């Protein structure tokens, strides 16, 4: 239930959903993350050749505004086959190839919106995703066929048409807003109608384990840099430069933040509860890491939900397995590995 009103290069991981067994169906994953802007070309290679039917997740981004994507495909690895992932991006002189080296908590609802302008190529690209905790449950893509808000989790498919109509009406409103803003921000920063620019929106609400309201968010960004955001008290704005102060004043004079507070404190919480209940078999589970040590000292963790975890040198970003679970490892060059997870009885410790 949504509202009703710089360049970073990617990090690449190539891995399987499950541990590889020669002859056993599996899933090959390429997780690209931490990059900006969102234009990226990702290929999955099999023996120096492009794999034909590769799918990918809906575009989303992290706190720092950097985007992340999961490209994946079903495959049965054998003895001779070798695999890799290729990534192109504006920050790369040539596409990078990475080979597949075979050898009790709070809750949240978050909506992510991304608009990218396409000078002289039609409307801007618009992508919207919705999350409960670390489980995405709705999406919208302007380039897609439906032109509707679409489910991405079982527990949201129960909702009837009045819900899906209202969501489709609300997302298209979020789209129009971004389209207008793209032309506006172009004007206030004196940029040409020939360049491509990105506008990102994020908002949502947190609740304790008692499902009572904890925190609320509403942030806006231009070309990967902060533009305006709601303070933690949800009653005032943070403008980032002389251009965003003009918006801050127009919004404080129209008391926009008051309508936001109501949603973030009331409506957002209310539907987060309805979702948590409707998908309790999913959202309210906790899966514990299937964990062991790899020797360079490397600590491993597989098939755990939610993604929040701590291992304590090289620490690789947590990555989706593609089945709802996540993975992570850490490395260091009389040593111990500490594993604080929100689904383990008590912290674990590991040593050779």
């Amino acid at each position: 239930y949504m509202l009703d009103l710089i360049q970073r290069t990617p990090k690449i991981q190539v891995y399987s959903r499950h541990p590889a067994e020669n002859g056993k169906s599996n899933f090959l994953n390429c997780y690209v993350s931490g990059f900006h802007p969102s234009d990226i070309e990702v290929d999955l290679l099999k023996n120096g050749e492009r794999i034909e039917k590769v799918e990918h997740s809906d575009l989303s981004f992290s706190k720092d505004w950097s985007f992340y994507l999961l490209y994946y495909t079903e495959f049965t690895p054998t003895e001779k086959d070798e695999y890799a992932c290729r990534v192109n991006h504006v920050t790369l002189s040539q596409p990078k190839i990475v080979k597949w080296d075979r050898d009790s908590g709070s809750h949240s609802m978050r909506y992510f919106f991304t608009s990218v302008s396409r000078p002289g190529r039609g409307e801007p690209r618009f992508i919207a995703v919705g999350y409960v905790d670390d489980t995405q449950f709705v999406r919208f893509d302007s380039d897609a066929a439906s032109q509707r808000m679409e489910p991405r989790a079982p527990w949201i498919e129960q909702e009837g048409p009045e819900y899906w109509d209202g969501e489709t009406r609300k997302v298209k409103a979020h789209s129009q807003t971004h389209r207008v803003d793209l032309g506006t921000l172009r004007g206030c920063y004196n940029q040409s109608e020939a360049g491509s620019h990105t506008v990102q929106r994020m908002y949502g609400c947190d609740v304790g384990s008692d499902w009572r309201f904890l925190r609320g968010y509403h942030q806006y960004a231009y070309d990967g840099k902060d533009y305006i955001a709601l303070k933690e008290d949800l009653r005032s704005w943070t403008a980032a430069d002389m251009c965003a102060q003009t918006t801050k004043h127009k919004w404080e004079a129209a008391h926009v933040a008051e309508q936001l507070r109501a949603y973030l404190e009331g409506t957002c919480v209310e539907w987060l509860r309805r979702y948590l209940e409707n998908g309790k078999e999913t959202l309210q589970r906790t899966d514990a890491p299937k964990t062991h040590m790899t020797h360079t000292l490397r600590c491993w963790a597989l098939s755990f939900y939610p993604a929040e975890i701590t291992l304590t040198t090289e620490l690789v970003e947590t990555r989706p397995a593609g089945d709802g679970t996540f993975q992570k490892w850490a490395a260091v060059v009389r040593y111990t590995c500490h594993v604080q997870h929100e689904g383990l009885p008590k912290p674990l410790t590991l040593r050779w």
Partner: nanobody, 115 residues
């Protein structure tokens, strides 16, 4: 380990055409996909067209329909027929190839200019 010999570049009038050719050395079983990326005014190089030894092709959106890639049944050699060239196709075109172990090799490139 592999060397890529490029030819066919140069200057051409708008609306003209050019045929690029790239030939791989080494063992005939040491290269699978071959194709071309092209330099942007910026830092990156964009995909133009490539083809697997079995004939599977992929093109960059901005040359779809105008450019065609092909391969010699015998030798490891690919051909890029560029038609209806525009000034925005001016760039250095780099041939590349992939080993059957997903190792990438890259040629020196060939400047293509469209008045």
């Amino acid at each position: 380990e592999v060397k890529l010999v490029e030819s066919g570049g140069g200057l051409v009038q708008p609306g003209g055409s050019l045929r690029l050719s790239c030939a791989a050395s080494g063992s005939i079983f040491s290269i699978n996909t071959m194709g071309w990326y092209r330099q942007t005014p910026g830092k990156q190089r964009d995909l133009v067209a490539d083809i697997s030894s079995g004939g599977s092709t992929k093109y960059g959106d901005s040359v779809k329909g105008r450019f065609t890639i092909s391969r010699d049944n015998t030798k490891n050699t690919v051909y890029l027929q560029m038609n209806s060239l525009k000034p925005e196709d001016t760039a250095v075109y780099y041939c590349y190839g992939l080993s059957y172990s997903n190792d990438d090799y890259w040629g020196q490139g060939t400047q293509v200019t469209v008045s």
